[PDB]
């Protein structure tokens, strides 16, 4: 029937763990798209910000608390990888210790990127393994002929 999949696509609960920076754009997104998000109740955790070595156990306890179906969105270059901070105090990506499903590059990403992350994540939730032999298609490959056909852009001396 696959009604359960529609159930999971239609409704998702976001756990906002945005850190010092990079969360002002996430708030910009959240106040337009949406006190509902609560610990040990959500199934989606939007990791944003620079994952620091000191606070990584906090993210590991919050990952442990949530239920069996766990989804994680990494936002920003500082969370996908170490980003610009390849330094002793920054872990080189959040995927080192928790599995990640969707990666959203940027520094900081835009609210529209968050919107497209929810769209690609309901699209992934609607094809079930989890890969299902459908996720090999990539945005690098899907819009490639769209992007290559671009020729002219407005000159940058204008507003």
């Amino acid at each position: 029937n696959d009604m359960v999949n529609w159930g999971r696509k239609n409704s998702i609960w976001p756990y906002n763990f945005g850190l010092s920076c990079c969360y002002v754009e996430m708030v910009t997104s959240f106040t337009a798209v949406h006190l509902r998000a609560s610990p040990r109740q959500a199934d989606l955790m939007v990791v944003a910000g620079t994952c620091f070595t000191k606070m990584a156990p906090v993210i590991q306890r919050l990952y442990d608390q949530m239920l069996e179906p766990k989804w994680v969105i990494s936002m920003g270059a500082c969370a996908n990888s170490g980003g610009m901070y390849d330094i002793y105090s920054v872990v080189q990506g959040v995927d080192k210790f928790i599995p990640v499903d969707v990666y959203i590059p940027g520094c900081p990403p835009r609210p529209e990127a968050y919107m497209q992350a929810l769209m690609l994540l309901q699209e992934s939730i609607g094809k079930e393994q989890g890969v299902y032999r459908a996720n090999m298609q990539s945005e690098r490959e899907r819009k490639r002929g769209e992007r290559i056909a671009v020729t002219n852009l407005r000159t940058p001396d204008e507003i």
Partner: protein, 270 residues
């Protein structure tokens, strides 16, 4: 896009379904399971006393009021076994303070209901629904009506806004340690609670089954819908009141109001 308001709740209920349930270690198991249904079944069976129709009455029992008060009193046990099953002094004290303000603000509804059941003079709901034939029992009892409103919105309907958080430090909201289907059980419980409080309010204060120019069951349904929309409007308008201000405007202000309400109704009825 989804065109129905309820479809969001439908998807939410489906989501809460088929979620793995985890056992808590070093915890009691019977109360961890039983605390949701003390909150759910109480306001589910609060629906069993409404005269929705003379021919489709859900229960033709002689007393419905006492059953409602028995469920109102029983509801606290759900917050208490939830507090003890939290097994965290922070969350336990959060549920202790929530049950505190609950017992504090549950006092008023019985004394407010005494006015309408005294001018009605019976516990069988057929007598109440036949009493509001020409004059409804809302014109004289404004104070009783608003006191019952405050009491009805004060029973774990989120108007106090201390359920999932705590203004006072060292403690935490008691909806945290439940994360499986029991959380959906909480939401459906407050949903049946708000609709049953609205239905009881319309059928006990105003006049159900009047039918001025249209069949009376849809008249009852539309009036209930208007009071639903007004309840949601004032719930949204109502800001979060901190614990102190709630304690200040509790037993001091509305116990005298309902006592003079009983005096007024007893003086005017004879």
């Amino acid at each position: 896009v989804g065109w129905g308001g309820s479809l969001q709740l439908v998807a939410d209920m489906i989501k809460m379904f088929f979620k793995e349930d985890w056992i808590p270690k070093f915890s009691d198991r019977v109360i961890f399971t039983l605390a949701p249904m003390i909150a759910f079944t109480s306001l589910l069976l609060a629906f069993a006393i409404v005269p929705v129709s003379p021919g489709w009455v859900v229960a033709d029992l002689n007393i419905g009021i006492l059953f409602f008060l028995m469920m109102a009193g029983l509801a606290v046990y759900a917050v208490l076994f939830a507090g003890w099953s939290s097994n965290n002094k922070y969350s336990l004290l959060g549920a202790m303070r929530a049950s505190a303000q609950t017992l504090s603000y549950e006092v008023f509804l019985g004394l407010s209901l005494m006015g309408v059941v005294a001018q009605a003079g019976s516990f069988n709901m057929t007598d109440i629904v036949n009493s509001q034939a020409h004059v409804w029992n809302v014109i004289p009892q404004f104070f009783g009506f608003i006191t019952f409103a405050i009491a009805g919105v004060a029973v774990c309907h989120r108007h106090p806004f201390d359920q999932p958080e705590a203004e006072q430090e060292l403690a935490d909201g008691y909806h945290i340690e439940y994360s499986g289907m029991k959380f959906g059980l909480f939401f459906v419980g407050e949903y049946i609670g708000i609709v049953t409080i609205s239905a009881l309010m319309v059928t006990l204060f105003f006049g159900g089954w009047q039918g001025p120019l249209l069949p009376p069951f849809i008249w009852f349904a539309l009036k209930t819908a208007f009071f639903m929309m007004m309840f949601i409007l004032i719930r949204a308008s109502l800001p979060r009141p901190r614990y102190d201000q709630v304690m200040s405007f509790g037993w001091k202000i509305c116990l005298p109001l309902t006592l003079i309400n009983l005096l007024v109704t007893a003086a005017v009825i004879l």
